């Protein structure tokens, strides 16, 4: 949304805006650490610093073809 919780596991768990635009990358910094020491993790599994916490795009690839 524009507020996402934010869990620092085994720590403190919070609200964090997030502008439109933000990333993931954003969310750490703003409960003060960095990227480069976490791994940040979206229902379980990770997901790299710099994609947008908005998905305004997606791919749909046929396991068969056409």
Request: without cysteine.
């Amino acid at each position: 949304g524009r507020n996402v919780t934010v869990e620092v596991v085994g720590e403190e768990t919070s609200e964090v805006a997030v502008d439109d635009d933000g990333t993931y990358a954003d969310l750490v910094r703003a409960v003060d650490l960095s990227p480069h020491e976490v791994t940040v993790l979206v229902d379980g599994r990770p997901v790299p610093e710099d994609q947008s916490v908005e998905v305004d795009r997606v791919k749909v690839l046929r396991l068969i073809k056409g």
